C-alpha cells in the first residue's frame, strides 16, 4: 500500500506490537515505571508508524543513555508552579519528555473541557518525540490541540552562520468527519534527525552533505536569505522559544542540552481549544471536512498526482505498516539488539 | 536614516500627522464615527510607517468603495455569540475590520488580565490591515499578543494550481526591555498586496511577472513543491483558517469575498497571554532581550551586514519616517486626492 518513505532490502518488517513490547521491556528494565514506559513506547512507535524515522525507535538509544547517566529522572515530581482555570506552568523535574508532555496535555484538555480553553507550558523537561503526538491527544477528545517544543541549537538565524535556533516544531490537530487533520512540522526546512532536505549551511554557508555535522547548520523554513521568506521560518522558530522557553522561565534553544545531560531544560507549549464551547462539534467537523474535500478536489498540477491534506500521508503510512509491519533499517535493528544485550532483555 | 523600502523621485514625503488627519477626514465624511475613523487611520498609518505599502493608505480606496457599496457596516453591532472567562466568539456585523479587530483584541487583553489567558475569535468581519497592529496592542500592555486573519483566495495548495488558500498572516508581539518583539508575516512567500516576491504560479505553474493576475496564484512559504517545505507554508495557511474561519462558524479563505461585497465574512483570531500570571514580567523582558542580543551578536554571514530581530526594521523605518515624513508613491498620491475630490474634503 502507500508508505511515506522508501523501504528496500536494507529494511526489516517488525510487527508493531513487537516493537512496542520491546521498547517497554528495555525501559522497565532500566527502572522506568511501566505506565510511563508505555507512554514513551506509544510516542516512539507512532513516529515509526507515521514514517518519521528520525523520531522513532532510532532514538531509543538517546533515552537509554539519558536514563543511565541520570540525565533523565525516573520518578519526576512534575509540579504546577502557577495555575488558573485555563492555564498552568509546569516544571518537568527532568522527567522523560513523553511523560511530562502527556501529563501536561492531559491537564490542558481538562481545563479546556471545563472552561473552553487550556494552555499548559512546561520547562525543565526532555526531548518529547513528535509534537503531533500531543496535539492528536486533544483532537481524539473532540478538541483542537496545539503543541510546540524548543530543542538543541541546530539552525542559523537569517543573516548568520552559527547554530543558535532550534528546529522547534509546531503541531495542530483538529477533529474531522474522518481522521484528524494533523499539521506537524519543524520550523526549519528539515529536522536534523532527518539527515541520515535543504538546510544548506556549510563552513561559511553553502550546502554539501556532510559539512553540516562538521560545524554546519540547518536553514530555517524559507531558505538561505530573505528573498524567499527565510526570515519567516526564523521568526516561527522564535515564536516557539518565546512561548515555550522564555514564558515558562525555562530557557531558549541555544541553552538546551542533550538528553544525557542533567538540566537539558527542554521546554514545551500545549494549547487546547474545546470546540464545543464555540460552535457545535458536529458542525465544526462537517465544515472542516468540506474544506478538506474541496482543497483535495481542486485543480491538480500536471506534475502532481494528488493534493494531500496534512496528516494524510502519515495516517495512510500507519495503516499500511499496521498490517504489513513497521520497516526498521538494518543498522538500527542491530543497534536495538545491542541495547537489549546491554540491559539484559530479549531483543527483536 | 534606515528605511525598509526603496524611495526615489517617484515618492512624496507626507507628514505622518497630515496623512492621519486626511484619512480621518475622508472616513468621517462618509459617515464613519470619528473614533472608529481614528482606529482605521492608526492601523493604515502604522503600516505606511513600518514600510508595509501594500497595507497602508494605498488601501483606503478599498474601504471607501466598501462603505459606499454597503459592503462595510458603518454602525456594526459587534455581538458576543459565546463567551467564557477566558474566551469569546464575536460576530463583527460586517463592520470595518480595524474596528472589529480593535474591540476583539481589547476584550482578549481584558480577559487575559483577569484570568491569565484571553482568546477571542471573530467572524463576519472585513479586511483588517496588518496583523501586527493587533498583536502590538497586547505587547504594549505587557502581554504576549497573537493575531491571525484569513483572506481572499490567492494561494495554491501544494500540488495544485488554483487560488484557494488565503495569504493568512500570523503575528506575535512580546514586550522586551526596549521595543516589542514583533513577528508579522503572511504564510505565503509574499502578500498579493506586494505585487506592484517569489510566488511563482503562472498559467499552469511557473512564474513570470504579470501572469499572476491573469489566473495566476501565489506560492506558500517553502516554495513550489515539497522539497523545500512548500507543504509547510500550506499547512500554516490552513492553521489560520481553522482557528479563524472554521472554529468561529464563519468561513474559510475560498469563500471570503472582497470588501465591497456584503458578507465578505473575513474572520480573525486573537490570543493574549498575560505574562505576569506565568513569570515576573521584568524577568521575562530581561530574558527575551538577552536572547535577542545574543542572536544579533552571533557570527554574521560574510554576505550579510547584520542579523535583525523581527520588528526591528519596521520600528527603525517608522522612527525615520516620523521626522523625515512618510513616503507615498506618485500614482497613489494622485489616487488619494481623487478620493478627496469625490467625497468632497481637503486632500493632501
Ligand atoms: N522533539 C523535537 O525537538 C523535534 C521534533 N520534530 C518532529 O519531527 C517530525 C519531522 O517533521 P518535518 O520533517 O518538519 O515535517 P514533514 O515535512 O515530514 O511534514 C510537514 C507536515 O506537512 C504534512 N505534509 C507532507 N507532505 C504533504 C503534502 N504533499 N501536502 C500536504 N501536507 C503534507 C505532513 O503530514 P504527514 O503526517 O501526513 O506526513 C506534516 O504534518 C515532526 O513530527 C516534528 O514534530 C522536529 C524537530 C524537533
Ligand atoms: N489582512 C490580510 O488579509 C493580510 C495582511 N498581511 C499583512 O501584510 C504584511 C506583509 O507581510 P510579509 O511580506 O509576509 O512580511 P515581511 O517578509 O515583510 O516580514 C516578515 C517578518 O519578518 C521580519 N523580518 C524582515 N526581514 C527580517 C530579517 N532580515 N531578519 C529578521 N526578521 C526580519 C519582519 O519585521 P519588520 O516589521 O521589522 O519588517 C516581519 O515581522 C504583514 O504586516 C501582514 O500582517 C498579509 C497578508 C494578508
UniProtKB/Swiss-Prot annotation, chains A, B:
Superkingdom per UniProt: Archaea
Record's subcellular location: Cytoplasm
Keywords: Cytoplasm, NAD, Oxidoreductase, Tricarboxylic acid cycle
GO MF annotations, alphabetized: L-malate dehydrogenase (NAD+) activity
EC number per UniProt: 1.1.1.37
UniProt enzyme class: oxidoreductase
One GO term describing the cellular component: cytoplasm
One record GO biological process: tricarboxylic acid cycle
Protein name: Malate dehydrogenase
Annotated organism of origin: Pyrococcus horikoshii (strain ATCC 700860 / DSM 12428 / JCM 9974 / NBRC 100139 / OT-3)
Lineage: Archaea, Methanobacteriati, Methanobacteriota, Thermococci, Thermococcales
GN (gene name): mdh
Amino acid at each position: 500500500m502507500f508508505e511515506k518513505g522508501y523501504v528496500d532490502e536494507n529494511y526489516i518488517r517488525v510487527p508493531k506490537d513487537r516493537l512496542f513490547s520491546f521498547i517497554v521491556r528495555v525501559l522497565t528494565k532500566l527502572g522506568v515505571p511501566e505506565e510511563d514506559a508505555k507512554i514513551v513506547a506509544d510516542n516512539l512507535v507512532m513516529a515509526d508508524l507515521r514514517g518519521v524515522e528520525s523520531h522513532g525507535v532510532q532514538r531509543l538509544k538517546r533515552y537509554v543513555d539519558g536514563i543511565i547517566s541520570g540525565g533523565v529522572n525516573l520518578h519526576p515530581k512534575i509540579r504546577v508552579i502557577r495555575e488558573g482555570p485555563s492555564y498552568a506552568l509546569i516544571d518537568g523535574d527532568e522527567g522523560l519528555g513523553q511523560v511530562v508532555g502527556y501529563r501536561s496535555m492531559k491537564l490542558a484538555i481538562k481545563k479546556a473541557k471545563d472552561t473552553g480553553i487550556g494552555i499548559v507550558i512546561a520547562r525543565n523537561s526532555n526531548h518529547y518525540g513528535i509534537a503531533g503526538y500531543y496535539a492528536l491527544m486533544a483532537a481524539e477528545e473532540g478538541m483542537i490541540g496545539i503543541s510546540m517544543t524548543n530543542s538543541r541549537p541546530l539552525v542559523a538565524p537569517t543573516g548568520g552562520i552559527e547554530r543558535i535556533l532550534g528546529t522547534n516544531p509546531i503541531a495542530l490537530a483538529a477533529p474531522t468527519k474522518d481522521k484528524p487533520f494533523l499539521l506537524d512540522m519543524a520550523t526549519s526546512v528539515v529536522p536534523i534527525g532527518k539527515l541520515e532536505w535543504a538546510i544548506n549551511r556549510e563552513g561559511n554557508i553553502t550546502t554539501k552533505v556532510e559539512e553540516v555535522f562538521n560545524g554546519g547548520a540547518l536553514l530555517p523554513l524559507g531558505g538561505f536569505g530573505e528573498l524567499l521568506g527565510g526570515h519567516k521560518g526564523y521568526g516561527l522558530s522564535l515564536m516557539v522559544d518565546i512561548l515555550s522557553g522564555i514564558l515558562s522561565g525555562g530557557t531558549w534553544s541555544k541553552y538546551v542540552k542533550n538528553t544525557s545531560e542533567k538540566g537539558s531544560n527542554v521546554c514545551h507549549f500545549f494549547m487546547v481549544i474545546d470546540i464545543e464551547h464555540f460552535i457545535p462539534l458536529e458542525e465544526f467537523k462537517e465544515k472542516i471536512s468540506q474544506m478538506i474535500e474541496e482543497i483535495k478536489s481542486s485543480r491538480k498540477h500536471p506534475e502532481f498526482e494528488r493534493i494531500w491534506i496534512h496528516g494524510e500521508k502519515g495516517f495512510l503510512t500507519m495503516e499500511t505498516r499496521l498490517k504489513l509491519g513497521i520497516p526498521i533499517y538494518r543498522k538500527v535493528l542491530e543497534e536495538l539488539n545491542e541495547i537489549a544485550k546491554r540491559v539484559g532483555v530479549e531483543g527483536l
